Amino acid sequence: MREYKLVVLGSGGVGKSALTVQFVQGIFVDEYDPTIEDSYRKQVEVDAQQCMLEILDTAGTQFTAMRDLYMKNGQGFALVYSITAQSTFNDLQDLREQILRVKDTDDVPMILVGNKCDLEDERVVGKEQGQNLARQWNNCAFLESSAKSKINVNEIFYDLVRQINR
Amino acid sequence: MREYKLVVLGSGGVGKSALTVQFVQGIFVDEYDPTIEDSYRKQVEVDAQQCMLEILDTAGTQFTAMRDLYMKNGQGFALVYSITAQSTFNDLQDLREQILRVKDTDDVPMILVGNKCDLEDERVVGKEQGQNLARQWNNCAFLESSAKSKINVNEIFYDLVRQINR
Amino acid sequence: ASAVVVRVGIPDLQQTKCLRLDPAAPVWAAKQRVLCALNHSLQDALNYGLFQPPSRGRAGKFLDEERLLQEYPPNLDTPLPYLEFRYK
Amino acid sequence: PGASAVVVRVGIPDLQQTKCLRLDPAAPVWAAKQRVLCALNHSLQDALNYGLFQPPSRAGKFLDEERLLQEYPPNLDTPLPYLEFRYKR
Ligand SMILES: Nc1nc2c(ncn2[C@@H]2O[C@H](COP(=O)(O)OP(=O)(O)OP(=O)(O)O)[C@@H](O)[C@H]2O)c(=O)[nH]1
Ligand SMILES: Nc1nc2c(ncn2[C@@H]2O[C@H](COP(=O)(O)OP(=O)(O)OP(=O)(O)O)[C@@H](O)[C@H]2O)c(=O)[nH]1
Ligand SMILES: [Ca+2]
Ligand SMILES: [Mg+2]
Ligand SMILES: [Mg+2]
């Protein structure tokens, strides 16, 4: 049984914690409690194999000392934005470049996540913006998700696992 | 706490059981054991309400007297085919007509499911075929899923709950 | 030679399964079929026994594993005979 | 249990069959026998009287069903560990 060190990144309020808790516990966190650093461990079955996922849910893009540590130790990275907030989308390019500079390679398990897709009446970021960005990131994996509706949540973390096994 | 009686139907071998066991238990059933009738109960959180889901996983057309009792009693229906077998997609039409006869109306919570979307190389039923079929069924909900990859599994049952709630 | 359909409820899993059981074979062999249809989802699985639940004019009791299945007349409640798989 | 699995070839001399199965090393021997029974497709009479059996590597013996399967180290001749399923009474 192998361990997978997964890291959830993004600006404040995009739904990093809600996605994590929805995947780990199966409930929706309606509160917004600003995160410093939380970690979760969960044994799941991915592609017929038992896996120990350790999910690190981080502070805003902030606590710089910890940020350097989880970029060197993380095996897969979910870069999360909110479809309701253009600035949180623009914030991701810098993150992606920080990760690659620390890993010293572009071959880094990664997934781009547009969260809050249930909020169609507040969407400012089109799905095709995220698709085009992911394409620029060397055909990065891309998903629109909803932690509130439990849409494409486990798909985020299971895809990271498959990337790491490759 | 409300109860929801969901029914998974389709021809044999399409993934009815694997989708159900994936959702309820979180494991992928690699074997094909022909079902007569299996039931599962599971409490989940849907749109911030605790819900008791009763999932009936049914046989492949076989057991015609049994069929009428689970069609009268089901509140929502997942109509499942396999994207690798054209015959299982054609069988879904006479299955939906039987739900509409038994319940006397066409406002029945329903989702059409093309399963085994992880088997792209073996695809025979194009995605647009499924989208067209859903549209002519009174703009029916439509998903392509993979019980093996855990893609769009819970999204099937959560959407039926939402249709029942509305 | 023969087979009949029996609905078996496993309360500890909150699930029910319709199984083809051999009425002419012992109860332990019917329990063997129940075990094989659960894969390995039941912890401590061998401490479970087939149980006839209470029903109309009929008290609940564990089936004697050395008797043939057909020596227990089915309950008349339901369209299909019903048994449960219960911990001891 | 649950974390791992090991492939073991199991010979059933009364059926003149062998089968390679995944068994749980951290589970009791009786749960490994349960997996063997579910692989035979009810082809055995008095199957519950059969027990898992270690061939001589020497002299054989039945495995204690209360022990974890991993308490019996594997024979390292074979590429796959080998066990037998024989009548125990
Ligand atoms: N409508 C809707 N709201 C969401 C969704 N996901 C998160 N939210 C809300 O957005 C707010 C911020 O969510 P968090 O998960 O705490 O955001 P975060 O800052 O990235 O997570 P932290 O790592 O804890 O700081 C919370 O009130 C959530 O309930 C979603 O998918 N849909
Ligand atoms: N590649 C792939 N195989 C699948 C998928 N879902 C099911 N299968 C396999 O297809 C076969 C059919 O699975 P079942 O779930 O038993 O199909 P079913 O006949 O509709 O279900 P029953 O109610 O038990 O009759 C099994 O061997 C599954 O492992 C999938 O999403 N992808
Ligand atoms: Ca999902
Ligand atoms: Mg937070
Ligand atoms: Mg099946």
Side-chain angles (χ1 to χ4, degrees), chain D residues 1-64:
Chain D
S4 40
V6 66
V7 177
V8 178
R9 186 180 312 259
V10 176
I12 314 97
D14 289 349
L15 296 174
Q16 290 154 94
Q17 296 174 12
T18 79
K19 305 199 193 289
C20 284
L21 320 167
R22 307 179 176 83
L23 306 182
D24 189 342
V29 167
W30 56 252
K33 158 176 157 162
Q34 208 38 239
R35 298 198 169 178
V36 172
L37 285 166
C38 296
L40 294 173
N41 309 334
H42 76 75
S43 292
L44 247 189
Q45 289 319 310
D46 309 286
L48 266 297
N49 280 346
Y50 283 70
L52 280 160
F53 183 86
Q54 184 130 70
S57 150
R58 265 287 79 67
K61 73 208 159 150
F62 283 98
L63 280 52
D64 187 345

Side-chain angles (χ1 to χ4, degrees), chain C residues 46-77:
Chain C
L46 306 173
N47 284 133
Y48 283 77
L50 283 163
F51 182 72
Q52 164 199 101
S55 54
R56 188 177 199 168
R58 173 163 321 197
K61 72 188 162 209
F62 282 99
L63 277 52
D64 186 342
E65 297 195 347
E66 302 290 281
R67 297 287 281 288
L68 308 170
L69 179 60
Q70 65 210 0
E71 297 188 271
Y72 290 99
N75 55 353
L76 319 161
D77 283 36

Side-chain angles (χ1 to χ4, degrees), chain A residues 8 10-19 28-36 38 57-60 80 115-119 145-149:
Chain A
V8 189
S11 324
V14 300
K16 301 187 297 304
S17 283
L19 285 169
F28 171 64
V29 180
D30 47 305
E31 309 77 44
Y32 165 47
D33 222 299
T35 296
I36 298 198
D38 297 335
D57 168 41
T58 66
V80 178
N115 192 43
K116 311 205 198 186
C117 78
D118 60 285
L119 292 183
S145 71
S146 171
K148 184 164 169 291
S149 303

Side-chain angles (χ1 to χ4, degrees), chain A residues 26-28 45 47 148-155 158 162, chain B residues 26-28 45 47 148-155 158 162:
Chain A
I27 67 185
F28 171 64
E45 186 182 286
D47 290 348
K148 184 164 169 291
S149 303
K150 202 175 181 63
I151 291 180
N152 264 342
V153 182
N154 78 273
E155 286 85 354
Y158 278 46
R162 292 184 185 105
Chain B
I27 56 151
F28 175 60
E45 179 176 297
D47 295 341
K148 173 182 200 191
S149 290
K150 213 175 177 43
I151 292 167
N152 266 341
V153 176
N154 73 278
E155 287 84 354
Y158 280 42
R162 289 182 183 111

Side-chain angles (χ1 to χ4, degrees), chain C residues 2-48:
Chain C
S2 204
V4 301
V5 179
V6 176
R7 185 188 313 272
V8 181
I10 308 99
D12 278 353
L13 301 176
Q14 282 306 291
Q15 76 197 29
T16 76
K17 297 178 177 291
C18 287
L19 306 194
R20 294 211 232 268
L21 306 185
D22 176 7
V27 165
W28 59 253
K31 156 167 156 174
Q32 262 317 128
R33 296 205 179 174
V34 173
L35 283 170
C36 291
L38 306 180
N39 235 340
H40 261 249
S41 56
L42 258 206
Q43 308 295 332
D44 204 19
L46 306 173
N47 284 133
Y48 283 77

